[PDB]
Enzyme design. Structure first.
Site, PDB file in Angstrom:
ATOM      1  N   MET B  12      36.409  44.636  30.690  1.00  0.00           N
ATOM      2  CA  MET B  12      35.460  43.547  30.873  1.00  0.00           C
ATOM      3  C   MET B  12      34.901  43.548  32.288  1.00  0.00           C
ATOM      4  SD  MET B  12      36.582  40.012  28.977  1.00  0.00           S
ATOM      5  CE  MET B  12      37.513  39.765  30.492  1.00  0.00           C
ATOM      6  N   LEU B  28      28.378  37.407  30.659  1.00  0.00           N
ATOM      7  CA  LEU B  28      29.448  36.974  29.772  1.00  0.00           C
ATOM      8  C   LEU B  28      28.912  36.027  28.705  1.00  0.00           C
ATOM      9  CD1 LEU B  28      33.033  36.185  30.861  1.00  0.00           C
ATOM     10  CD2 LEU B  28      31.852  34.673  29.262  1.00  0.00           C
ATOM     11  N   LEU B  34      31.121  38.238  22.036  1.00  0.00           N
ATOM     12  CA  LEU B  34      32.193  37.400  22.558  1.00  0.00           C
ATOM     13  C   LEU B  34      32.040  35.939  22.160  1.00  0.00           C
ATOM     14  CD1 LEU B  34      34.656  36.838  24.595  1.00  0.00           C
ATOM     15  CD2 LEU B  34      32.910  36.750  26.414  1.00  0.00           C
ATOM     16  N   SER B  66      37.468  40.090  42.474  1.00  0.00           N
ATOM     17  CA  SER B  66      38.324  40.737  41.491  1.00  0.00           C
ATOM     18  C   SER B  66      38.821  42.092  42.003  1.00  0.00           C
ATOM     19  CB  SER B  66      37.574  40.941  40.176  1.00  0.00           C
ATOM     20  OG  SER B  66      38.344  41.773  39.315  1.00  0.00           O
ATOM     21  N   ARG B 100      32.058  45.641  31.097  1.00  0.00           N
ATOM     22  CA  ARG B 100      31.189  44.938  30.170  1.00  0.00           C
ATOM     23  C   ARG B 100      30.214  44.005  30.895  1.00  0.00           C
ATOM     24  NH1 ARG B 100      28.050  43.986  27.095  1.00  0.00           N
ATOM     25  NH2 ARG B 100      28.145  43.329  24.906  1.00  0.00           N
ATOM     26  N   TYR B 101      30.668  43.301  31.941  1.00  0.00           N
ATOM     27  CA  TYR B 101      29.924  42.190  32.536  1.00  0.00           C
ATOM     28  C   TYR B 101      29.585  42.335  34.023  1.00  0.00           C
ATOM     29  CZ  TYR B 101      31.788  40.141  28.255  1.00  0.00           C
ATOM     30  OH  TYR B 101      32.081  39.925  26.943  1.00  0.00           O
ATOM     31  N   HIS B 199      46.232  36.705  26.964  1.00  0.00           N
ATOM     32  CA  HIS B 199      45.035  35.889  26.810  1.00  0.00           C
ATOM     33  C   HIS B 199      44.952  35.376  25.376  1.00  0.00           C
ATOM     34  CE1 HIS B 199      40.866  35.124  28.624  1.00  0.00           C
ATOM     35  NE2 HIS B 199      40.802  34.592  27.416  1.00  0.00           N
ATOM     36  N   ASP B 276      46.209  43.563  38.067  1.00  0.00           N
ATOM     37  CA  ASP B 276      45.962  42.187  38.463  1.00  0.00           C
ATOM     38  C   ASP B 276      44.493  41.853  38.266  1.00  0.00           C
ATOM     39  OD1 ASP B 276      48.476  41.070  39.286  1.00  0.00           O
ATOM     40  OD2 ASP B 276      48.415  42.409  41.037  1.00  0.00           O
ATOM     41  N   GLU B 279      43.391  36.302  35.887  1.00  0.00           N
ATOM     42  CA  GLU B 279      44.403  35.678  35.038  1.00  0.00           C
ATOM     43  C   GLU B 279      45.788  35.707  35.669  1.00  0.00           C
ATOM     44  OE1 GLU B 279      44.723  37.135  30.993  1.00  0.00           O
ATOM     45  OE2 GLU B 279      42.516  37.212  30.795  1.00  0.00           O
ATOM     46  N   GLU B 283      45.342  32.172  37.661  1.00  0.00           N
ATOM     47  CA  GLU B 283      45.841  31.282  36.621  1.00  0.00           C
ATOM     48  C   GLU B 283      47.364  31.208  36.641  1.00  0.00           C
ATOM     49  OE1 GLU B 283      44.373  31.990  32.645  1.00  0.00           O
ATOM     50  OE2 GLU B 283      45.466  30.241  31.881  1.00  0.00           O
ATOM     51  N   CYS B 339      37.151  43.579  10.099  1.00  0.00           N
ATOM     52  CA  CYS B 339      37.885  42.350   9.835  1.00  0.00           C
ATOM     53  C   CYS B 339      37.527  41.833   8.444  1.00  0.00           C
ATOM     54  CB  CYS B 339      37.556  41.280  10.880  1.00  0.00           C
ATOM     55  SG  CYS B 339      38.310  41.511  12.517  1.00  0.00           S
ATOM     56  N   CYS B 347      29.478  45.716  13.530  1.00  0.00           N
ATOM     57  CA  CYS B 347      30.814  46.299  13.603  1.00  0.00           C
ATOM     58  C   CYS B 347      30.932  47.511  12.694  1.00  0.00           C
ATOM     59  CB  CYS B 347      31.873  45.247  13.235  1.00  0.00           C
ATOM     60  SG  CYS B 347      31.916  43.787  14.324  1.00  0.00           S
TER      61      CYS B 347
END
Ligand SMILES: CC(C)(C)c1ccc(-c2nc3n(n2)C(=O)CC(CNc2ccc4ccccc4n2)=N3)cc1
Ligand SMILES: CC(C)(C)c1ccc(-c2nc3n(n2)C(=O)CC(CNc2ccc4ccccc4n2)=N3)cc1
Ligand code: FES
Ligand code: FES
EC number: 4.98.1.1
Lengths: 359, 359
Positions: B12, B28, B34, B66, B100-101, B199, B276, B279, B283, B339, B347
Site C-alpha cells: 500500500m 486511498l 478498497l 512512513s 498503491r497510494y 488489521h 514497521d 500501525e 497505533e 469471492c 476481479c
C-alpha cells in the site's frame, strides 16, 4: 476388572426420537453459557414448545432422530479397545457419554463415573475447535456439578479441551475429501471448489474473543496443506438463527453465489464436527444440496462423508488420550487464558478447577 | 548486464514526509477496490483535505513519515543478492517497488519494468495473507494499467499472491517473539499473553468471502506450533475506522479487557505486515502501549520487533521467488477462485490476466 480410567466424551447431543425433541430444546434455551435471555427460566419453556413441531419435522426428514449417540458410542468403543493396549498402566479404560442437552446428560455421566470408582477422569470434548459456547459450556457443567452438589471429586480430573490440528484428525478429513473428489466426473475434478462449512457464531460472541473461528481456520489450513492445495477452497459458516449479526459468509449464500458466478461443481466439507447430525443430514443435504443447489442450477454438489465410523478416527481419539496421559497435562495452555472480554464468572472458576487438580 | 527478471514488490505504501500525506489520502479514498463512496471523484478530495492535518500529526508523532520504503528497499536489495546466486538462469534480478497510494506508484513501476526490457515479471505482494482490499487491489491495478494504456505486456507476468505459512516467514515471527519474551522479567515470562494483532476488515468484506481472516489465522497457528504453545494467545484486530461493523475483538478493547481481568503482562505481535509502519509505531506503540496501557495499570506490555531488516526475512523472500520460478506457477490455486459474493467485475479479468499468461 474394575474400571480405572474414565474418558468422558462431551457433545451437545441430539434428540434420539421425535419424542425427545421438546426436552432437548428446553435444556438448550435454558443454557446460559450458550445464550442469555430475558428471564431464562420462563422464556425458554415457551420457545421450546413453540419450536418443537418445526424441529420434530426436521428430524422426521432425516429418519426420525439424531444419530449422534450411535456414532459417539462406536467411536468410544474403538477408542477404549486401542487404549487398553496403548496404555496398560491406566487400563482398564471406559468411555462415558456426556451430552449437554439430552440423556445421558453430562451430570448423569459424572455420577456414574463416580459410582464406578475411577482413579482418573478425562473430560474429552468432541469439538476439535474450542468455543466457550460448546466445549466451554460442557466444562462449566462439570465444574457446576461438583459445586452445586457441594462435595469434592473422588477422581483425578483433566481435560482434552481442544485438538483442531491433530495429525490424524487432519488425515481423516483429507481422506474423506479425496474419496468424495473421486465421485465427481473426472472431467470436472479440477473444477471442484471445496467449501469448508462450520457452525457459525453470533458476532457478539466472536467480538468478545471466542477462539473458535481461528481454530476452525487452522483445521482448514492443515487439511488443505495435506491435500497440497489440489483444489481452491473457502471457509464459510452455517446454522445462523435469529435477527442479530453472525459470522459470515453464510454457507447457503456462498453456494448460491458460486453457482451464479459459474462455479457449478462444489464439495461441502463439514469441518467442525466428527459425525453426521442435523447440520449435515438436514441443513446441508436437504436444505442446501437438494433445494437450493437445484433452484440455482448446479452441475454437481456433493458432501464429504462425516468421520462417523472411520477406524482411523478411533485411533485419533486414542492417540489424543494416550498423549494427554503421558504428558501429565491438565488442560491446553489455551484454556489458561479466558476471553479478553469474558463477562461470565464461571469461566475463571472452571479453568482453575482443571488447572488446580491433584496429579 | 541487462536485467532479465523483475520482482515487483507490492504494498500500500505510506507517506515519506508530512507533505506527502494529502496525496496519499486522496489516492486511498479514490481506490474503488478498497472502498466506494458517494460522488467519489469529489467526495474523496473533500475527506482527504479534511483529514490531512490529523494524519500529518500522527506521522509527526513517529518521526515525520512512513518507514515502509526504507524497509522495502532493504528487503528487496537482500532478496536480489540471494536470487542472483540462487537462480543464475534468471539473473540478473531487479526489484521494483509498486506502492498503491504513494510514489513510486504501481503504474510507474510497470512503466520502468517495460522500459528495462525484462523477460519475466513477478507481481510479489508483500502481504502474506490475501485480502481483496490489499493484494487484490494491487493486482487489479496491474491489469487496469495494461487495459487503460491499451496494449499487451512485453514481459511474461506471474504473481506470488499470498504466502501466509511460508516456513521462513514463520521462523522470523517466532524468533522475534522469543527475543521479545526474553525482555520480560524472568518471573513473568510464563505469565505473558501473546496478542497477535492484524488489521481488521469491515464485516461487509468478511461476509462476502474475503480469505484474509482465515489466512491470518493460519499464520498464527504455524507460529504457535513452532513456539510449542509456550504461552497462551489470542488473535485480535486493529485499525477499525468509521461507524460500520468490523471484525473484532478490537486490539485496544482486548488489551484493556485482559488488564482489567488480571492479565498484566502482554506481548503484541503484528502478524499481518513485515515492517514497521503507522500501525505499529503509532497505533500500537503510542495509542495502545503508552496511553491505553498506562490508564489500565498494566505491569509490562511489549511488542515484537517488526521483521524489517532481518536477513532471514530476505532469505524468505528470495526462497519464495526461487520456488515460484522453479514451479512455473502463474498464481496460487486460491487465486483461481473469486469471492463467492464478489460484486466486482474486475476481479475475474485480473485473475484471468494471470492464469492466461504465456509461459
Ligand atoms: C431465536 C432463537 C430461536 C431464540 C435462538 C437465538 C439464538 C440461538 C443461538 N445459537 C447459538 N447461539 N445462540 C450462540 O450464542 C453460540 C452458538 C455456537 N454453537 C456451536 C458452535 C460451534 C459448533 C461446532 C460443531 C457443532 C456445533 C456447534 N455449535 N450457537 C438459537 C436460537
Ligand atoms: C470513515 C472514512 C475515513 C471515510 C473511512 C471509511 C472506511 C475506511 C476503510 N479502511 C479499510 N476499508 N475501509 C476496507 O474496506 C478494507 C480494509 C483492509 N485494509 C487492510 C487489510 C489487511 C492489511 C494487512 C497488512 C497491512 C495492512 C492491511 N490493511 N481497510 C477508511 C476510512
Ligand atoms: S466466555 Fe470465553 S472464557 Fe468466559
Ligand atoms: S472481491 Fe474478492 S474476488 Fe472480487
Amino acid at each position: 476388572r474394575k474400571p480405572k480410567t474414565g474418558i468422558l466424551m462431551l457433545n451437545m447431543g441430539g434428540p434420539e426420537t421425535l419424542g425427545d425433541v421438546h426436552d432437548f430444546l428446553l435444556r438448550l434455551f435454558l443454557d446460559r453459557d450458550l445464550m442469555t435471555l430475558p428471564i431464562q427460566n420462563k422464556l425458554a419453556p415457551f420457545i421450546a414448545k413453540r419450536l418443537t413441531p418445526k424441529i420434530q419435522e426436521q428430524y422426521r426428514r432425516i429418519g426420525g432422530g439424531s444419530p449422534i449417540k450411535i456414532w459417539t458410542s462406536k467411536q468410544g468403543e474403538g477408542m477404549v479397545k486401542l487404549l487398553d493396549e496403548l496404555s496398560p498402566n491406566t487400563a482398564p479404560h471406559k468411555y462415558y457419554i456426556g451430552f449437554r442437552y439430552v440423556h445421558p446428560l453430562t451430570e448423569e455421566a459424572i455420577e456414574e463415573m463416580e459410582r464406578d470408582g475411577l482413579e482418573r477422569a478425562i473430560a474429552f470434548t468432541q469439538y476439535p475447535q474450542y468455543s466457550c459456547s460448546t466445549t466451554g459450556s460442557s466444562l462449566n457443567a462439570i465444574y457446576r456439578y461438583y459445586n452445586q452438589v457441594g462435595r469434592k471429586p473422588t477422581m483425578k480430573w483433566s481435560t482434552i479441551d481442544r485438538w483442531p490440528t491433530h495429525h490424524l484428525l487432519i488425515q481423516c478429513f483429507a481422506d474423506h475429501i479425496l474419496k468424495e473428489l473421486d465421485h465427481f466426473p473426472l472431467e470436472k475434478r479440477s473444477e471442484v471448489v471445496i467449501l469448508f462449512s462450520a457452525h457459525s457464531l453470533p458476532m457478539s460472541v466472536v467480538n468478545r474473543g471466542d477462539p473458535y473461528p481461528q481454530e476452525v481456520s487452522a483445521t482448514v489450513q492443515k487439511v488443505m496443506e495435506r491435500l497440497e492445495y489440489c483444489n481452491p477452497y473457502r471457509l464459510v459458516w452455517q446454522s445462523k438463527v435469529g435477527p442479530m449479526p453472525w459470522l459470515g459468509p453464510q454457507t447457503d449464500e456462498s453456494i448460491k453465489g458460486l453457482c451464479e458466478r459459474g462455479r457449478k461443481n462444489i464439495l461441502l466439507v463439514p469441518i467442525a464436527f466428527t459425525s453426521d447430525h442435523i447440520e449435515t443430514l438436514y441443513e446441508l443435504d436437504i436444505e442446501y444440496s437438494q433445494v437450493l443447489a437445484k433452484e440455482c442450477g448446479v452441475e454437481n454438489i456433493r458432501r464429504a462423508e462425516s468421520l462417523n465410523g472411520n477406524p482411523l478416527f478411533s485411533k485419533a481419539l486414542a492417540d489424543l488420550v494416550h498423549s494427554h496421559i503421558q504428558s501429565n497435562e491438565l488442560c491446553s495452555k489455551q484454556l489458561t487464558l479466558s476471553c479478553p472480554l469474558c463477562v461470565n464468572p464461571v469461566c475463571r472458576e472452571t479453568k482453575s478447577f482443571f488447572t488446580s487438580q491433584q496429579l
